[PDB]
Write a protein that binds this ligand. Sequence first.
Ligand code: ASN
Ligand code: ASN
Ligand code: CL
Ligand code: CL
Lengths: 366, 351
Amino acid sequence: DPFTMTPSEDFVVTDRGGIVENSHRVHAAVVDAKGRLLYALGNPTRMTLARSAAKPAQALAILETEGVAGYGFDDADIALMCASHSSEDRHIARTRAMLSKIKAEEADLRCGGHPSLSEMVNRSWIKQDFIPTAVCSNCSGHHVGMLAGARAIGAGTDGYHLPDHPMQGRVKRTVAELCDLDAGDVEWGTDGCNLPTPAFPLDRLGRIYAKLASAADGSDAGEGQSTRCAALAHIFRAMARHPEMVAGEGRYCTMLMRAFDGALVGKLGADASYAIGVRASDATRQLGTDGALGISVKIEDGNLEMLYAVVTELLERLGIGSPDVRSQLASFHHPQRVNTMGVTTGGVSFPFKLRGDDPRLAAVAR
Amino acid sequence: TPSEDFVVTDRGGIVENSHRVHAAVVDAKGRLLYALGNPTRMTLARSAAKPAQALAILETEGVAGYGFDDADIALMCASHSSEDRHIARTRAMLSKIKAEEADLRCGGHPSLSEMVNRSWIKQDFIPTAVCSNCSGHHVGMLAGARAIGAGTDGYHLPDHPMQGRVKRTVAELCDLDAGDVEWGTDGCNLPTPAFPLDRLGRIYAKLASAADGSDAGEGQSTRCAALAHIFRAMARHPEMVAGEGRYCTMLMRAFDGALVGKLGADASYAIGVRASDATRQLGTDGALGISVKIEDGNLEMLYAVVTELLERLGIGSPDVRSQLASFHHPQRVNTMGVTTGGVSFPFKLRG
Ligand SMILES: NC(=O)C[C@H](N)C(=O)O
Ligand SMILES: NC(=O)C[C@H](N)C(=O)O
Ligand SMILES: [Cl-]
Ligand SMILES: [Cl-]
């Protein structure tokens, strides 16, 4: 019965010959520039570890640290501070360039190597028996930013990654401020790169990216801006102009931002979160808001292939982009289900229902 | 009405991911003894149905003349890691039936073992049909085709007599009518069945029950005798069923003949447990079957839940199950060696 559909039924499902294989619960929030909730799937206020979808907010703490401007970080450097890069050689090279700009060494990094986020890079590493190091971390440009901030204020580079360090005090404050949350409403764990990483309600992730895109609109319009809005507009512009620094070739974030060519930024969080800040457009206005928009997504079970499918389907349902823009993401939207002899064995479907109904139909966030 | 049963991973006490678990524990006739989630969930068994499909091969007239041995039969029940020793046995079995690799209708794929696949990548190796994790099963299907004079071209299509036999045999083992088993196409290009999750447990209860009756000298039909043979072959050659470091191999080695277990792609699992003090404490006087499906398809979580289930059920000693400790509580350690989180099992088995 379609007249009693509920948030708890918001799934992305794969099939084999029409028989259900796997299904994945979806949570999504679409918010305006003040964080007002416009559309939802699942539980839009789910307490969620943002993971690297929080890196642009952490990068604002770096950019607002007195003295950092003196180092001459350029837009590509700042995109790398916002990144989960593929450890391509240009990412490793830019990390070494940034270390030189602040006169630090790779031994000053407290993040660690891992297998590349790109299969193609990993394949090359395997052939050469290469063991990744700190400078290869997908979060290396962010760790260099944190080192830069520590040096700028005279705090010292030892322990920049620890919560008692002044840089982490600044990060924690800035994240809660961008979310419009009290400190006790943001929880903190330890990330794969060994930095504190925040958790907060999923819609406030959307809220951070609606503020990024709104700042981009204020800047493009020539409006006087606070130092913070100017810094948010700089982050937006850096990500959108250097999206390959944010991820890498073949990566969803890079292909999404190239496709939209300035109209939005997007960023992955590990274990299948996603965030998008959408500049004001005919599409946002048709959706019922006069400003910018933020979108945030979490796949409950952590599946990345399903995340990219769902995010792409969500952009289509919200009317964001053109069929031709979004067709650049078609391999993510409808993942190949082809067996070892080249026969198509099934596919992906999206039995979820965006909600903004009989008044008696309860939408219990689940 | 199924309850909400999850395995949950956390980072610092904060929920990261959660995975819905379905499980059925059944006795030798298939009566439901304990459950998680929806124990009758319609579920693609994938390679957890390989032993049942292998019974069709073993029951085919003339197949006994090829001289397949127990390790060979274990390969027919396998999702092996494409180790060089699995490749060699696939070629050996092709020689017993006078076939060649071109006769195979499965395709190569990245190895189920990460270590094997990195070895292949380092050497620019392109896997072929003989490397398929289901190669031994395909060689069995070729064997049955040749045995009845069916012709080896198209042994994998539903209208081939071998597939007619497989289709009929799966439903019989499940105790289902033909129309209660649904069929899709597998990664290896064979038909593959879907049926209620509890019937998967039932198949494996029948495997273990046949082993019990064989070990006791009982009046066994030809079918029970072959089910017993399948159980013995898997328990005696668990490295053919999977490979080094693989959960099924380590589970079966740990238990040393008391059970068999088998993985299904997209995170199904089946165990047939021979009658024991453990099963008697669980309230049944014969063998027992266990089947499990992680709704979202996560394998790490599957292995964790299966081992937690063995512990809840008291199957094995604590010493035996501690051999699976790395699967039971997967590592949650970051790139700098710091423990960042863990796995929890906030569910209760319902009886
Ligand atoms: N892209 C990511 O979310 C990576 C994550 N920040 C980590 O270090 O584990
Ligand atoms: N292990 C498996 O279930 C493999 C599966 N039978 C396939 O061919 O895709
Ligand atoms: Cl497939
Ligand atoms: Cl981690």
